[PDB]
Amino acid sequence: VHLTPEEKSAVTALWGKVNVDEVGGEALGRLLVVYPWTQRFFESFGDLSTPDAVMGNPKVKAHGKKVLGAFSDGLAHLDNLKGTFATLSELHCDKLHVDPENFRLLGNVLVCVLAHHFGKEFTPPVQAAYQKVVAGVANALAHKYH
Amino acid sequence: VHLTPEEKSAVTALWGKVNVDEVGGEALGRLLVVYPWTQRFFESFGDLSTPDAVMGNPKVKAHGKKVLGAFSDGLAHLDNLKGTFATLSELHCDKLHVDPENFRLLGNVLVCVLAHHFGKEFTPPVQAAYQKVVAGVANALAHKYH
Amino acid sequence: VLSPADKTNVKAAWGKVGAHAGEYGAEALERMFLSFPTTKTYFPHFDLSHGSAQVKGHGKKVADALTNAVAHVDDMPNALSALSDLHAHKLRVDPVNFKLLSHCLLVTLAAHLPAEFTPAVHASLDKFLASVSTVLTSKYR
Amino acid sequence: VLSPADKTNVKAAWGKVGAHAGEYGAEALERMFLSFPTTKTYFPHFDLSHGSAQVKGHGKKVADALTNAVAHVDDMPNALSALSDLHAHKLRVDPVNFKLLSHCLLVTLAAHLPAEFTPAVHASLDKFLASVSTVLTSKYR
Ligand code: HEM
Ligand code: HEM
Ligand code: HEM
Ligand code: HEM
DSSP states (O other): OOOOHHHHHHHHHHHHTSOTTTHHHHHHHHHHHHSGGGGGGGGGGOOOSSHHHHHHOHHHHHHHHHHHHHHHHHTTOTTOHHHHTHHHHHIIIIITOOOTHHHHHHHHHHHHHHHHHTGGGSOHHHHHHHHHHHHHHHHHHHGGGO | OOOOHHHHHHHHHHHHTSOTTTHHHHHHHHHHHHSGGGGGGGGGGOOOSSHHHHHHOHHHHHHHHHHHHHHHHHHTTTTOHHHHTHHHHIIIIIISOOOTHHHHHHHHHHHHHHHHHHGGGSOHHHHHHHHHHHHHHHHHHGGGGO | OOOHHHHHHHHHHHHTTGGGHHHHHHHHHHHHHHHOGGGGGGOTTOOOSTTOHHHHHHHHHHHHHHHHHHHTTTSHHHHTHHHHIIIIIISOOOHHHHHHHHHHHHHHHHTTOTTTOOHHHHHHHHHHHHHHHHHHTSOOO | OOOHHHHHHHHHHHHTTGGGHHHHHHHHHHHHHHHSGGGGGGOSSOOOSTTOHHHHHHHHHHHHHHHHHTTSTTSHHHHSTTHHHIIIIISOOOHHHHHHHHHHHHHHHTSSOTTTOOHHHHHHHHHHHHHHHHHHTSOOO
């Protein structure tokens, strides 16, 4: 995604230090809590009437688990995301009917969860690249709408 | 994009009766009035302090025709909107700094204009077509952001 | 977030809508399902096909509900708090959809009241539909 | 459009930031300027390089603006009334920028307050900043 080496370094460095098991879930829980309408796409998860069961909820953590794997996917497919998320594009759009704004919201949350755990070590410069990564995926994801 | 011969028909049909001297200006006028922050990109045009002011303005009527123009060109290459707008996209994104959400609002203003002119001749099936187009242009124009 | 002038037209417009409120709400609702298919899913228990009766049964509701928001335009978050709970908590509608139904209302109102759809009114109406929308989508948890 | 409980987290969050105010506003601003570079075109004359005393002067002006908003919370159009004339009539800031800035204050706070940036919290500040922005961009004519 036209990123520079600089922006590639700062990233792949901080992604390694990512809790491949707890961040995906931290994100989806946060989306679901702040952008509650996103909850409609997750009835089969069950209890989400409060911020706590949401965060706690296994399925969420279980799902956020996969979601992130897709982010790590492109984070080493930066020259071809449109491809990387084709099927994922076909799912959320044609089959799920998820409004593309939400992808920009989730990734924007993904930047918040990352900004939580890595505090100071998440600098404006880093953000700017991630913001670029999230933009990519986000749009790359909306493609079956292009 | 990709409409259906059913749609391609109703559009090219309707497009014909459009007054290629008023509509473009109509849309650009309402854009400016309804979503006023957009005036910011038009200081060079002069007086735009009141609806009548903006709508009256010939600088607006002038620019409106150029804009309408590009739609016409695009309606003609529904199979290559991305390329058709390639330079305009560098123009609007890299050079002018317009936020893409605004391309979507001009497209919706246009559609309100076609409804205002063509009254009930502008039917759900037809607007649906047009909505496919203006979305298309909107997406096409936004590429230097993709 | 409106204005004295705005409200004036919101009425001036409503005015020439009067007892057509249901004829319109339908068309808006239909233009919406037609132009933006994803919005359909919010109505599975619905024969959406043209002329659908329940669709019109809805059109009149929505319109009336708007007629309310115009009258109680100064106490909205309150006079429409039953609909927010419905649309935010229960139904859980994406805020993006209120943008579409609103656009379609402006289009509908557009093609049926060519004289009240003046740039300054359009601007006004747009602001009004904007606020109502923030209401019905403002109680999420 | 904020539940009495939101305001709670807004004041236990505002508090935990206190003197960092002017400091964090500068960091919220830099993130915006770097992550979303078009935003720079609204400050033509400024120097927006790291440690720019210009950014920091403003960052605080901004953070003060907020604490002032976190005060007259239910009479915002009126408290922030004047700032609405600057960003809406004089500067005509694209409303999309507000969303950009708000997302940065957020990321700024979650990197400097892990002890108070829990979910229920996060959604409170977002509802808040959004209402803040709605107003500062709500007067356009
Ligand atoms: C851009 C960020 C996102 C990524 C990377 C992502 C990724 C994924 C992945 C990898 C799956 C599992 C696919 C499979 O193997 O079956 C999935 C499923 C799903 N996602 Fe997302 N997602 C994102 C955003 C969203 C948003 C914004 C929503 C709606 C609020 C959403 C709703 C769903 C739903 C309902 C499923 C279940 C699909 C099924 O199993 O039938 N996702 N997502
Ligand atoms: C998506 C629908 C739009 C189309 C088809 C379109 C098309 C055009 C065209 C054909 C030109 C003149 C190019 C030239 O002669 O060099 C132009 C110029 C311009 N447009 Fe747009 N435009 C659209 C939306 C917008 C929006 C939403 C804005 C911001 C509110 C905007 C702002 C401008 C400005 C400031 C210029 C002057 C460029 C110059 O003088 O170098 N346009 N546009
Ligand atoms: C102008 C904005 C809107 C207004 C004023 C409005 C108003 C209403 C009203 C008055 C009702 C029925 C209330 C009752 O009988 O208890 C209703 C129901 C409903 N609305 Fe809306 N609405 C709006 C936008 C939307 C949008 C954007 C959607 C999503 C596409 C939506 C989806 C629904 C659904 C699914 C129901 C329940 C239908 C049923 O099963 O009976 N509404 N709305
Ligand atoms: C959290 C939302 C925001 C708040 C609370 C805020 C607050 C303020 C305040 C308090 C001032 C100085 C007012 C005065 O002393 O007269 C100001 C000035 C200004 N703001 Fe904002 N602002 C916000 C968002 C934005 C955004 C998104 C932009 C667009 C990039 C922007 C652009 C400007 C500009 C260009 C000035 C004038 C600077 C100068 O000439 O010294 N603001 N803002």
